[PDB]
Design an enzyme around this catalytic site. Structure first.
Site, PDB file in Angstrom:
ATOM      1  N   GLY D 143       0.803  -1.219   0.000  1.00  0.00           N
ATOM      2  CA  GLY D 143       0.000   0.000   0.000  1.00  0.00           C
ATOM      3  C   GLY D 143       0.834   1.266   0.000  1.00  0.00           C
ATOM      4  N   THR D 145      -0.034   4.189   1.664  1.00  0.00           N
ATOM      5  CA  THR D 145      -0.041   4.624   3.062  1.00  0.00           C
ATOM      6  C   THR D 145       0.865   3.726   3.890  1.00  0.00           C
ATOM      7  OG1 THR D 145      -2.332   5.400   2.856  1.00  0.00           O
ATOM      8  CG2 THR D 145      -1.490   5.099   5.098  1.00  0.00           C
ATOM      9  N   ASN D 206       1.873 -12.666   2.780  1.00  0.00           N
ATOM     10  CA  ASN D 206       0.469 -13.043   2.560  1.00  0.00           C
ATOM     11  C   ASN D 206       0.299 -14.357   1.799  1.00  0.00           C
ATOM     12  OD1 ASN D 206      -1.173 -11.263   3.994  1.00  0.00           O
ATOM     13  ND2 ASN D 206      -1.432  -9.807   2.297  1.00  0.00           N
ATOM     14  N   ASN D 228      -6.169 -12.388   8.786  1.00  0.00           N
ATOM     15  CA  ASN D 228      -5.886 -11.515   9.918  1.00  0.00           C
ATOM     16  C   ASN D 228      -6.016 -12.191  11.272  1.00  0.00           C
ATOM     17  OD1 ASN D 228      -5.411  -9.473   8.070  1.00  0.00           O
ATOM     18  ND2 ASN D 228      -7.454  -8.571   8.300  1.00  0.00           N
ATOM     19  N   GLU D 254      15.170  -6.574  24.508  1.00  0.00           N
ATOM     20  CA  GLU D 254      15.563  -7.984  24.571  1.00  0.00           C
ATOM     21  C   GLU D 254      15.296  -8.738  23.253  1.00  0.00           C
ATOM     22  OE1 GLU D 254      14.339  -9.811  28.306  1.00  0.00           O
ATOM     23  OE2 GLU D 254      14.823 -11.812  27.529  1.00  0.00           O
TER      24      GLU D 254
HETATM   25  N1  LIG Z   1      -2.888  -9.703   5.663  1.00  0.00           N
HETATM   26  C1  LIG Z   1      -3.546  -8.616   5.212  1.00  0.00           C
HETATM   27  N2  LIG Z   1      -3.067  -7.971   4.118  1.00  0.00           N
HETATM   28  C2  LIG Z   1      -3.714  -6.875   3.659  1.00  0.00           C
HETATM   29  C3  LIG Z   1      -4.929  -6.396   4.340  1.00  0.00           C
HETATM   30  N3  LIG Z   1      -5.354  -5.315   3.667  1.00  0.00           N
HETATM   31  C4  LIG Z   1      -4.486  -5.113   2.647  1.00  0.00           C
HETATM   32  N4  LIG Z   1      -3.524  -6.047   2.647  1.00  0.00           N
HETATM   33  C5  LIG Z   1      -2.403  -6.134   1.709  1.00  0.00           C
HETATM   34  O1  LIG Z   1      -1.722  -4.877   1.676  1.00  0.00           O
HETATM   35  C6  LIG Z   1      -1.384  -4.539   0.330  1.00  0.00           C
HETATM   36  C7  LIG Z   1      -2.164  -3.295  -0.055  1.00  0.00           C
HETATM   37  O2  LIG Z   1      -1.941  -2.326   0.966  1.00  0.00           O
HETATM   38  P1  LIG Z   1      -3.085  -1.590   1.843  1.00  0.00           P
HETATM   39  O3  LIG Z   1      -2.729  -1.687   3.312  1.00  0.00           O
HETATM   40  O4  LIG Z   1      -4.490  -1.939   1.382  1.00  0.00           O
HETATM   41  O5  LIG Z   1      -2.824  -0.078   1.353  1.00  0.00           O
HETATM   42  P2  LIG Z   1      -2.878   1.228   2.284  1.00  0.00           P
HETATM   43  O6  LIG Z   1      -1.799   1.131   3.333  1.00  0.00           O
HETATM   44  O7  LIG Z   1      -4.315   1.424   2.699  1.00  0.00           O
HETATM   45  O8  LIG Z   1      -2.380   2.355   1.219  1.00  0.00           O
HETATM   46  P3  LIG Z   1      -3.274   3.159   0.113  1.00  0.00           P
HETATM   47  O9  LIG Z   1      -4.400   2.256  -0.311  1.00  0.00           O
HETATM   48  O10 LIG Z   1      -2.257   3.388  -0.979  1.00  0.00           O
HETATM   49  O11 LIG Z   1      -3.750   4.394   0.844  1.00  0.00           O
HETATM   50  C8  LIG Z   1      -1.737  -5.772  -0.479  1.00  0.00           C
HETATM   51  O12 LIG Z   1      -0.599  -6.631  -0.540  1.00  0.00           O
HETATM   52  C9  LIG Z   1      -2.866  -6.407   0.305  1.00  0.00           C
HETATM   53  O13 LIG Z   1      -3.041  -7.807   0.106  1.00  0.00           O
HETATM   54  C10 LIG Z   1      -5.384  -7.161   5.519  1.00  0.00           C
HETATM   55  O14 LIG Z   1      -6.405  -6.824   6.155  1.00  0.00           O
HETATM   56  N5  LIG Z   1      -4.656  -8.227   5.874  1.00  0.00           N
HETATM   57 MG   LIG Z   2      -5.708   2.645   1.821  1.00  0.00          MG
END
Ligand SMILES: Nc1nc2c(ncn2[C@@H]2O[C@H](COP(=O)(O)OP(=O)(O)OP(=O)(O)O)[C@@H](O)[C@H]2O)c(=O)[nH]1
Ligand SMILES: [Mg+2]
Ligand SMILES: Nc1ncnc2c1ncn2[C@@H]1O[C@H](COP(=O)(O)OP(=O)(O)CP(=O)(O)O)[C@@H](O)[C@H]1O
Ligand SMILES: Nc1nc2c(ncn2[C@@H]2O[C@H](COP(=O)(O)OP(=O)(O)O)[C@@H](O)[C@H]2O)c(=O)[nH]1
Ligand SMILES: CC(C)(C)c1nc[nH]c1/C=c1\[nH]c(=O)/c(=C/c2cc(F)ccc2F)[nH]c1=O
Ligand SMILES: [Ca+2]
Ligand SMILES: [Ca+2]
Ligand SMILES: [Mg+2]
Lengths: 424, 309, 63, 437
Positions: D143, D145, D206, D228, D254
């Site tokens: 992502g 963010t 993942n 999750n 630690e």
């Molecule tokens: N394990 C897990 N992976 C997640 C989840 N949500 C998103 N991802 C993974 O995170 C990546 C996408 O990032 P996100 O966290 O959705 O993006 P963000 O941090 O919201 O960033 P922006 O959408 O760019 O604002 C992908 O590889 C997704 O599969 C979750 O609830 N659990």
């Molecule tokens: Mg997002």
């Protein structure tokens, strides 16, 4: 980022545009007068994307209707869902544009452009978080082509950080109003290369062939062509109009589909092609949506390579079976997907199917094969332009030949650029 | 319709495996750097095992066992044998070998030095078995295929890579009688074609000269050495329960002494087959190693022995 | 194989078993955040400089 | 005791936070309204669980948590969910417009307008701490963010809190559950900029969690909710030594001492067994030996790699349930002789065992069956560099063509920051091999 502002310009723009609001209003359970009569809450959960809420719990489309003559906008207001639109957003001139890009962009449309922008600004002002704009238009005529591309340029000035996508119907001799369409399209393409984030290349050649060959209609009307466009337009807009856990806006989507800024001309597609009783299995949807016969742009994807693909399936099916079938076509036709963008085919499934069908799939492909489209219009352009034929219509509106030479060169550049990535 | 890639161009063996696969109508070759394959036919050095088994929807196989270099480099082969209990420092079928970094006759190797004065220094077999008429040295090459399940398949046709010069005790500097390699010789083809004797003739010579057979006098010992060597490293390299699967073809170099005792000289990771036998072995690699994993529309002897104790 | 530093409590216990022995500043960050904003606002200027030229061509054609 | 603040940046960070805090609440008997009947000192305390929860005079137990996201929708489901009363609204921070899977937009453009607010809300929690330790940062590599704003946060936290530790819980990108195509860029960019600022980082691929959910929980197409709830069991395993009475891994310092001797190589491989389905009718309960032995099977690792072709710098077994020291030592003996467990020369070949007698707590109606005993191995092996090579290769393929780069540049970022960040990764891969071969 939720609200989208829709604009429809010219005869074609307003026709396919009116069908878009006919289809999606039915899907969101909104009647011809603007009142909700659905059953699922999912129909109202992201209704703000395309509708403003009005007094009496009415839903009014965030839609601005544009033309340089009253004809087609009077048909829209008379037509089945014409009462749902806000009357202030009907912005129209009188003397038309005579299938003339110059008139649309420089003279007649200039006179009208600022009043259209005021309606945009009106709609844009009372929008919690505007995510971008979409335009419906043809590139063949005067208004949608000339004034549509002028509006796109003016919107980019006033809103430089919002997304600008188009649904752009390309001309074809098979479905042809005037000999000057290739001129009008070449001048427009140059505009879209600079000022749009995505452009959905609806080719009238391709829609015609689909109506003729693969739907057994001998004499296809514009309504038959527009049926295919509205089904596709519902398709590309589903992932924003509903859930399901897809956390995407126009920008996020545009970031993942456009690897190079100038190369954002997509090949739309739809399965099954309609005009049924047996519902299609997941393998059939997948084989059909990748099938050249179901492409809305008349390009053979075998002649290019995919930069990115996005497929969105509608209806109740196994996401396992989707994943399997989508992985089956990639791993059995991997030469046609560029290796240098790993994992470039991505997929979504929406539970709510469209009207009539039990399960459909909508195809969005950024293939380099689209060069064939621009080559075809570039050939039609040069045939006329090498003898300066029909140019008097444009030079009489104050244009110079230099601008044609430029636009020709820019589209031949675009074609060269698509060729680069097809061989890498 | 499965898919493969080719990342070894020199490989004469897997050149034929590539050809046999293509001439079926069910296997397509892709480019060298395409990730979406079922089978990798990979490079010798720096084969990227970390990138295998991470492509969704594809069962991935590769023609090398990662960590099998511990058996195929000479320095590691000696250290493996002295440190493993299963093949100890008191191991009867391996010559006495030492490691110093860059009857008392030795041999040094990794330029080959045979003397008493002077990488790995190894006990040189002063009294080897000598073929007649000729009075000449040889080495046996056996081709072993370990599949994804770790079935050890010994290919039934081997070959003696022969010297054509009489073996000399006093004369160590002359290399064509002591070293029995195929390149060093090319009397090149006096007794047998290209200094290559096959298992039928070598069984017959033993019956006539020594009143015994290949199966008894030598091949039992070979099979014990192949099995002992591979089962030793099975835990370190086996691809059972792993996200990608491996097979590999090995070449085992042997030496038979005067009293018929068989000695392991070198294991060969990327071995070349003999000219005649390519067609059959490369079909076998496809049948057993590839087609088991990827089914389409015996030349081997399986090595297994569970003695209870 | 020695079992060293065993510590016990009512909710658990822990021990070690040994089988065999052997930043930029607030200035520099707030600087380079803004240096990207300079390149962002230079790029947006170049756009509105380019679009300004399209606006004077639009006047030149109608004139 | 010493307090620990958890920070959840981005969708993946936030929803994993959700899972963990739900689980922590069950483990400490804390309810959705925030009352903890078993706690007898009302209004305060210096217990082990107080490292993760503060207390108010009314009796509420309040997560030392800050949720950050550049768009509202995900954190809005915390605000309206089952544990809405648990958090103070100031802990939940949201922007309007996200980072569009764009590192540059999250770090530079949208980061800059929210970084100061977030630091302020973190300082509000740090001023309730009698002796702060540091931070547990939860985020995605993929992502915008998760990659972009995390790296900016981590830079500022090093300035504002120089004496404190920082731990990462990182979600490494998997194509099978991401729709983002530009993750390789985002993953490399954040890993470059966060590397010097992160003391210990727990990566969770993942891809690995997804197959564990398929193979062992019989879940045909695992959701994020499936992933999750499993990740939180692993995270809890890791953070239980901070939250319960014990002598192993009692502070964040630690973790760095036990698991990270070479400071750049601060990515320990987690392995976890047993994962057993609640829908399974008949289950034969696994022994100390079997579940310890399961920690050396790659199918149970949080990242798929091969520890046999690599070297260990440190190993930690963290048991939950009916386990006694001698059953563990016996298992370690059996396993040493059968498997390939090679250490580096300068580190002792050994294991730091931690046991908690309370068995794993499972979310009611969840996917995981109740077990008598479970274990989480934490091992700093050089095999995890497999993950970097993969990610780096994908980066190289795209970046050779400058694919998608204009989006990053267009948000102010310089092209040079791509190759600069890749060279740091090229260095990191080389550090791993020197140590491991
Ligand atoms: N394990 C897990 N992976 C997640 C989840 N949500 C998103 N991802 C993974 O995170 C990546 C996408 O990032 P996100 O966290 O959705 O993006 P963000 O941090 O919201 O960033 P922006 O959408 O760019 O604002 C992908 O590889 C997704 O599969 C979750 O609830 N659990
Ligand atoms: Mg997002
Ligand atoms: N201890 C020993 N006693 C007798 N002969 C020996 C020996 N060690 C090596 N040789 C001889 O030296 C020759 C070549 O040496 P070796 O087999 O160790 O290396 P190599 O690399 O040439 C085999 P390949 O290339 O087929 O794998 C063999 O043909 C063998 O006859
Ligand atoms: N698919 C489709 N194409 C149309 C329609 N109406 C016009 N066209 C095409 O659009 C071009 C003419 O443009 P038009 O929209 O009539 O001109 P404008 O009203 O000035 O924008 C020609 O190439 C026609 O083939 C329609 O309803 N559907
Ligand atoms: C399959 C999915 C994960 C949703 C995806 N990944 C990349 N692209 C996509 C899908 C779309 N990508 C787009 O760019 C897209 C465009 C679009 C969407 C709208 F909602 C409205 C107007 C548009 F032009 N519509 C899509 O459905
Ligand atoms: Ca006028
Ligand atoms: Ca208390
Ligand atoms: Mg018309």
């Amino acid at each position: 980022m939720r609200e989208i502002v829709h604009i429809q310009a010219g005869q074609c723009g307003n026709q396919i545009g009116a069908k878009f609001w006919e289809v999606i209003s039915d899907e969101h359970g909104i009647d011809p007068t603007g009142s909700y009569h659905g059953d699922s809450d999912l129909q109202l959960e992201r209704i703000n994307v395309y509708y403003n809420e009005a007094t009496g719990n009415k839903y009014v489309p965030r839609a601005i209707l544009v033309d340089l003559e009253p004809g087609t906008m009077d048909s829209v207001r008379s037509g089945p869902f014409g009462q749902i639109f806000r009357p202030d957003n009907f912005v129209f001139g009188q003397s038309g544009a005579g299938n003339n890009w110059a008139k649309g962009h420089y003279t007649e449309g200039a006179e009208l452009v600022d009043s259209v922008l005021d309606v945009v600004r009106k709609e844009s002002e009372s929008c919690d978080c505007l995510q971008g704009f979409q335009l419906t238009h043809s590139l063949g005529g005067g208004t949608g082509s000339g004034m549509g591309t002028l509006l796109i340029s003016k919107i980019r000035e006033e809103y430089p950080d919002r997304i600008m996508n188009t649904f752009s119907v390309m001309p074809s001799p098979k479905v042809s109003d005037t000999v000057v369409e290739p001129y009008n399209a070449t001048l427009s393409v140059h505009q879209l290369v600079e000022n749009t984030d995505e452009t959905y290349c609806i080719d009238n050649e391709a829609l015609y062939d689909i109506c003729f060959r693969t739907l057994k209609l001998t004499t296809p009307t514009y309504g038959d062509l527009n049926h295919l466009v509205s089904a596709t337009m519902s398709g590309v807009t589903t992932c924003l109009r509903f859930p399901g856990q897809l956390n995407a806006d126009l920008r996020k989507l545009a970031v993942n589909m456009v690897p190079f800024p100038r190369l954002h001309f997509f090949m739309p597609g739809f399965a099954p092609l309609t005009s049924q009783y047996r519902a299609l299995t997941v393998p059939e949807l997948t084989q059909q949506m990748f099938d050249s016969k179901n492409m809305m742009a008349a390009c053979d994807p075998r002649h290019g390579r995919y930069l990115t693909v996005a497929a969105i399936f509608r209806g109740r099916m196994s996401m396992k079976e989707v994943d399997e079938q989508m992985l089956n076509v990639q791993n059995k036709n991997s030469s046609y997907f560029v290796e240098w963008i790993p994992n470039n085919v991505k997929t979504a499934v929406c539970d709510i199917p469209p009207r009539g069908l039990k399960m459909s799939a909508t195809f969005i492909g950024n293939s380099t094969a689209i060069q064939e489209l621009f080559k075809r219009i570039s050939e039609q352009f040069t045939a006329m332009f090498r003898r300066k034929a029909f140019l008097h219509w444009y030079t009489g509106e104050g244009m110079d030949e230099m601008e044609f030479t430029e636009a020709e060169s820019n589209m031949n550049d675009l074609v060269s650029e698509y060729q680069q990535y097809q061989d890498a | 319709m499965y898919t493969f890639v080719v990342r070894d161009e020199n490989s004469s063996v897997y050149a034929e495996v590539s050809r046999l696969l293509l001439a079926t109508g069910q296997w397509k070759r892709l480019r060298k750097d395409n990730p979406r394959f079922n089978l990798m036919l990979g490079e010798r050095n720096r084969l990227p095992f970390g990138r295998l088994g991470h492509e969704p929807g594809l069962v991935q196989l590769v023609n090398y066992y990662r960590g099998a270099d511990k058996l195929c480099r000479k320095a590691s082969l000696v250290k493996l044998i002295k440190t493993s209990p299963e093949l100890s420092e008191s191991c009867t079928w391996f010559p006495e070998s030492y490691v110093i970094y860059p009857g008392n006759v030795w041999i040094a190797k990794s330029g080959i030095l045979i003397s008493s004065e002077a990488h790995v220094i190894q006990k040189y077999l002063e009294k080897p078995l000598l073929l007649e008429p000729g009075h000449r040295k040889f080495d046996i090459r056996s081709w072993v295929l370990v599949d994804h399940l770790y079935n050890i398949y010994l290919y039934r046709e081997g070959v003696l890579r022969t010297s054509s010069e009489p073996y000399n005790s006093a004369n160590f500097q002359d290399k064509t009688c002591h070293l029995t390699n195929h390149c060093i010789q090319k009397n090149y083809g006096r007794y047998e074609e290209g200094n290559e004797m096959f298992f039928e003739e070598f069984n017959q010579y033993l019956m006539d000269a020594l009143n015994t057979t290949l199966e008894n006098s030598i091949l039992l010992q070979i099979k014990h050495i192949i099995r002992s060597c591979l089962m030793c490293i099975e835990p370190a390299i086996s691809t059972k329960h792993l996200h990608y699967q491996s097979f590999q073809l090995f070449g085992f170099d042997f030496m038979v002494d005067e009293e018929l005792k068989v000695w392991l000289i070198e294991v060969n990771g990327a071995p070349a087959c003999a000219q005649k036998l390519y067609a059959e072995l490369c079909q076998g690699i496809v049948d057993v190693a590839i087609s088991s994993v990827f089914p389409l529309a015996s030349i081997f002897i399986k090595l297994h022995h569970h003695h209870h104790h | 194989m020695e079992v060293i530093e065993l510590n016990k409590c009512t909710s658990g216990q822990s021990f070690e078993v040994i089988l065999k022995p052997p930043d930029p500043s607030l200035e520099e960050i707030q600087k380079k955040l803004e240096a990207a904003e300079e390149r962002r606002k230079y790029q947006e200027a170049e756009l509105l400089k380019h679009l300004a030229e399209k606006r004077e061509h639009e006047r030149e054609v109608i004139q | 005791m010493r307090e620990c603040i958890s920070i959840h940046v981005g969708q993946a960070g936030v929803q994993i936070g959700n899972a963990c805090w739900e689980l922590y609440c069950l483990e400490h008997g804390i309810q959705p309204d925030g009352q903890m009947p078993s706690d007898k000192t009302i209004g305060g305390g210096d217990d082990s669980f107080n490292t993760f929860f503060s207390e108010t005079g009314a009796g509420k137990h309040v997560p030392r948590a800050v949720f950050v996201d550049l768009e509202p929708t995900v954190i809005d489901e915390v605000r309206t969910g089952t544990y809405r009363q648990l958090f103070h609204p100031e802990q939940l921070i949201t922007g309007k417009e996200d980072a569009a899977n764009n590192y540059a937009r999250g770090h530079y453009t949208i980061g800059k307008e929210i970084i100061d607010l977030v630091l302020d809300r973190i300082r509000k929690l740090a001023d309730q701490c009698t002796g702060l330790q540091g931070f547990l940062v939860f985020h995605s590599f993929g992502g915008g963010t998760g990659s972009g704003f995390t790296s900016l946060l981590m830079e500022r936290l090093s300035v504002d809190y120089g004496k404190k530790s920082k731990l990462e819980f990182s979600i490494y990108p998997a194509p099978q559950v991401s729709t983002a195509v530009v993750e390789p860029y985002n993953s490399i960019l954040t890993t470059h900029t966060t590397l010097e600022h992160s003391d210990c980082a727990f990566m969770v691929d993942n891809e690995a969690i997804y197959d564990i959910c398929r193979r062992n929980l019989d879940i045909e197409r695992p959701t994020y909710t499936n992933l999750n709830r499993l990740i939180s069991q692993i995270v809890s395993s890791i953070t239980a030594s901070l939250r319960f009475d014990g002598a192993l891994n009692v502070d964040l310092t630690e973790f760095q001492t036990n698991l990270v001797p070479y400071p750049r190589i601060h990515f320990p491989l987690a392995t976890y067994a047993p994962v057993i389905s609640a829908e399974k009718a008949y289950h034969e309960q696994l022994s100390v030996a079997e579940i310890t032995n399961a920690c050396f099977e790659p199918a149970n690792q949080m990242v798929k790699c091969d520890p046999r072709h690599g070297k260990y710098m440190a190993c930690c077994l963290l048991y939950r349930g009916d386990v006694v020291p001698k059953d563990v030592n016996a298992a370690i003996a059996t396993i040493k002789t059968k498997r390939s467990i090679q250490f580096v020369d300068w580190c002792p070949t050994g294991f730091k065992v931690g046991i908690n007698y309370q068995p794993p707590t499972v979310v009611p109606g969840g996917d995981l069956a109740k077990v008598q005993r479970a274990v989480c191995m934490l091992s700093n092996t050089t095999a995890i560099a497999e993950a970097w090579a993969r990610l780096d290769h994908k980066f190289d393929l795209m970046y050779a063509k400058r694919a998608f780069v204009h989006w990053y540049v267009g948000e102010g970022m310089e092209e040079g920051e791509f190759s600069e960040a890749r060279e740091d990764m090229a260095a990191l891969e080389k550090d791993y091999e020197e140590v491991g071969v």
